[PDB]
Amino acid sequence: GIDLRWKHVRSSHRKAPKSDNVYLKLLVKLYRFLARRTEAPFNKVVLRRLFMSRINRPPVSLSRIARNLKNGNEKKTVVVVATVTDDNRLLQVPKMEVAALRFTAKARARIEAAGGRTLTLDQLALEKPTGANTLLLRGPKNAREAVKHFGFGPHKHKKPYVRSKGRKFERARGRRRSRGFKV
Amino acid sequence: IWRKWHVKINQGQKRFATASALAASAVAPLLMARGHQVSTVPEVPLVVDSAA
Amino acid sequence: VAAKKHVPIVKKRTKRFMRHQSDRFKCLDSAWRKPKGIDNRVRRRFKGNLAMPSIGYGSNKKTKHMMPSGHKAFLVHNVKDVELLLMHNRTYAAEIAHNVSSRKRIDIITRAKQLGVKVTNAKA
Amino acid sequence: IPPKPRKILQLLRLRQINNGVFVKVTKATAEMIKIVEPWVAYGYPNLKSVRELIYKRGYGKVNGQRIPLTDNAIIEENLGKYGIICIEDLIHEIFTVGPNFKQAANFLWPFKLSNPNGGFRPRKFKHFIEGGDLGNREEHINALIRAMN
């Protein structure tokens, strides 16, 4: 006997992509080699984010990129391991160079129209193998419809499951002191 | 008889796949690996000068 | 020809793990089945009963799948298949399928002798 | 085993039968040992016993792994910053309680000993005074170490 509390406990994070894209398999091979034989911490972070599922890689927009291009960051390279989406609100697009997993049709056109350049994760390793002069970005993880229903309960101010919305659907008892109580 | 026989798939995905298959038809190593006998053809994108 | 030098082969077991209570009823085959009874004496590992198969009975990875000669069986069906063993004659051995005709059986044996490949079932 | 004495045995790194560790006696640790009386036996080691144990059963914790210590390069690589570079220094630190006793003692993996050669007493779950084996026996623990080592 050994009197242990835990035994044969597994890991908690993904160790390989679940997708079977052939090109993504090549991209993992490149960065798995780079992370082993390079001291730059930028490479290790990029490798793990390639394994993540779609809900853990939310899209980023052109506006969010322009927000972080101030206060002395006009000359750095933006790297986003996700999709990049055009924003209809932004009227004037600044000049930038972006390395992203993929672009929408309109986002690519407007970036190069202003005088920019669109890169690729493989070209990024060829130009900046150590990731010097770069900044990483993420999308809003919690900005999803399904997240608003999480942890429903009294005094929580969450969103209920209703087949429609109107005065005939819920409200009434338990939502106003005029009919019994309130929550 | 009212079980689901047919299926529905997006027209965007249909066009993606038929374009992928055409690209793989120009690769000679892939042709051999599928069991074809192309050891005596001049060019793998074979074209005939409209004699037919 | 003789095979490569290898470590001695140990089996760890020879018996066949017969099924419980299959020696008293003719409706039960001898193939092993896991007993799921709530109060079965075999499932509870009582002393003096049949043993149960475990992963601890496995064989060495070095000598797995090899017959006492030292080779590994490979099923062949015609003379074109046996030529696949040209470069493996000290590790693999040929075996003719049971549905091969008698005429094609002697054609294969003749070809296999040129390459030095051992044939397990040739005396016919 | 009751829930409170079990937790103390976990903090002393004694999770298996016939294990052994070194502890320096203070008021903070004397009360912990007194709680688990009917589970342990302890005493005062001498020079020979500590010398034999390190040579024969000495293993070190390296990156969370049990690496047997057979070369002086292993000890220096992990205890060099505290001034210990050879296997004789490790013995010196343990036997004469030094400023870096805590790091040296925690480096050694808990010892694993076999059952005694001559056996125990007729009933081994009384106190040493009554005629058992568990409890404090002062210098008489050296004889038990010879058999179990």
Place this chain on the structure above:
Amino acid sequence: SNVSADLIWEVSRNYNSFLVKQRTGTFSRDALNLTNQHSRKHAGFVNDKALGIVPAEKGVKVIAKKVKAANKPASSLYTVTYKSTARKAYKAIASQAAKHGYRADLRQAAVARASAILRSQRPVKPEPPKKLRGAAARRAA
């Protein structure tokens, strides 16, 4: 581009017409495959540079791949036949594969495969008659 040797291995890694998979091991019936194993290193039909040896009536016949004419398969093989001497054939094959950096890792396998083919064209000795151990009493009558 969108096609390379590495990509073709990804597509054909799991199944292809040349695969012979069964218990105790897997094999490949490929013309440009030495040792007849299924691996990226020995898969002739995917790599740009490959070697192959086929037995002739008297000696060995060696075919190689010309990287310049990949899209023209009718004229994409450089073939030559050696039927002079065992030692002379050995030297030519090794020089063909390890003097100008054309798959220098295949030097050892090409020579060994040629040695086996020539060994198989010799006359065969007669096998000694079989004996009996327990049926000797039966056949004594």
Place this chain on the structure above:
Amino acid sequence: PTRFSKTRKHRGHVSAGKGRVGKHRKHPGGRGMAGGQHHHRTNLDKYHPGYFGKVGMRHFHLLRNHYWRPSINIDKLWSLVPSDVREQYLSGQKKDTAPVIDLLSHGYAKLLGKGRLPEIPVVVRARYVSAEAERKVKEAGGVVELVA
């Protein structure tokens, strides 16, 4: 595809994963929404607070066409003009001509104002307009006119 599902892994195990003491009987607890006020109250109050009761006055023969008026904010107003013409105005090459946008032709009735507007005069023709939206378009040199 039934070849890979959990019912195939239950072969050979008695009770098929439903338990021995509780034997998966026909309909314990009732059918549908039975017991809403008696024995399913605890679930129906932690979630769905407000199932029971009456609120508000009723409307006979409601016709939804009387209440059709989709709205559009002001920061998306410039997206209505085509791209080729749009870039000319923002770049600053016209300098003497103003566009007249017809919201009804694009399927809108009310012009709300939420974001910001660049300093180029425009003309907006809408059925309804908010109080805050009228000010922002007016201080940019433009004017809004009701059209019915």
Place this chain on the structure above:
RNA sequence: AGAGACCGAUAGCGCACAAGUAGAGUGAUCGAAAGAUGAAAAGCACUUUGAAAAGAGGGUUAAAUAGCACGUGAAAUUGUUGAAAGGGAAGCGCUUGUGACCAGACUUGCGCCCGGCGGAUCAUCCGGUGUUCUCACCGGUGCACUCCGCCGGGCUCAGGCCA
């Protein structure tokens, strides 16, 4: 009328057959079982024992281990022949012993020296073609202390089982 990622004689309609038939009930009504010799009957002439049914010879056939109880013919249960055990149950697990029967493996390989036989052709050079542009093939030139195949003798090394 045309079809199927449908069933293949305990399945598919109750019915692949003289099936809403045979049969049960006063009546309304209830309602089965049952496909396959061989390519062709060529479906066994004649003799003999027997009261007869049938048997033994002899015939047809590629086959009667297909004979109208007929393609293939499993299990429960039974007969004959062979082997073995048994003082109020039998069966089973671990480990030897006796008797019967049996699969493997080994029976040579490489190299060197001497002797004998047979052949065209080893180094070198010239011409043509191909190719990874420096590596090769073909024709000619060689012509016996070189190269190749076989045979005989001698030597070193390795090779099966139990100790």
Place this chain on the structure above:
RNA sequence: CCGGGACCGAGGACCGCGCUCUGCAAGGAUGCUGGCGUAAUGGUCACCAGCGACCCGUCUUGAAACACGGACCAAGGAGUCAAGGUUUUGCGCGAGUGUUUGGGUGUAAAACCCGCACGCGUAAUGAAAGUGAACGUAGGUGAGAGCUUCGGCGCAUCAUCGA
């Protein structure tokens, strides 16, 4: 410091730490010799011998039970399908997205192409008439991976004060 006995031989060019330093017992066994080359070693089956071994399935706090079902064999025999929800995984496009009610065409229940409407999403709140989202570089403070001209800039997310 000298004797006696038992069990074991994992690894497969060199590399390292050392010593008694022409070498070695120092990061895992080698050397010499004999009989036999087949039923001898080994494997299967039957029987005798030593020790062990209560009938399965099920409900139950508790089953070998004087608790129930089970004479034997062959074939059949039990979590399925549709509509509507929900979370997680793969894929296409992305402020948009969905061809197939329908039309054109066809080697014809396949494949290919086209568009007006419409569905969900982009704006909430009140019983209702109604009204309808920027003081600031889209705010201030404390933590934050990563980057950096070394001064600093600070994604996601957590808490808190404001508009």
Place this chain on the structure above:
RNA sequence: AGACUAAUCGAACCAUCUAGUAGCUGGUUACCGCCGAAGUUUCCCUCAGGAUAGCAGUGUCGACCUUCAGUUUUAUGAGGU
């Protein structure tokens, strides 16, 4: 006499609605590997039954955050066996 009404009577026989409902008995079909329980809280014409919280598995993300603990020592409060 609750007797008799085709071997059927405290309400005949035949087909259909009908595969009538069951908080109640019985059964529920190949192998290996890893983790591993509960009979307790609140409400119900509730007590052979359900919802709710607890114990359990799997999928993950944020850092490898240096944070933590069924434990001892030191300082300082409460209790009525």
Place this chain on the structure above:
RNA sequence: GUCCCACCCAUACCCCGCCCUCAGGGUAGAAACGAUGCCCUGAGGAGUAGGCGGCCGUGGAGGUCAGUGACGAAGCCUAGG
């Protein structure tokens, strides 16, 4: 009743071999690799109700082995491997 020597054996403890699970490392100016591969190092393994992963068989459909067969396919019997 009390004290003292020697000795016997558990699936428990120590050392060694082998199987699987988990964790941490090495492997491209590629003479290179079922990269889902190979090499080095450490610890652990009881289990009803229940959860997840990997594999083996049966009836059909698309592709492929230029697959076997009247010189004998499928099926059945067999203290023969």
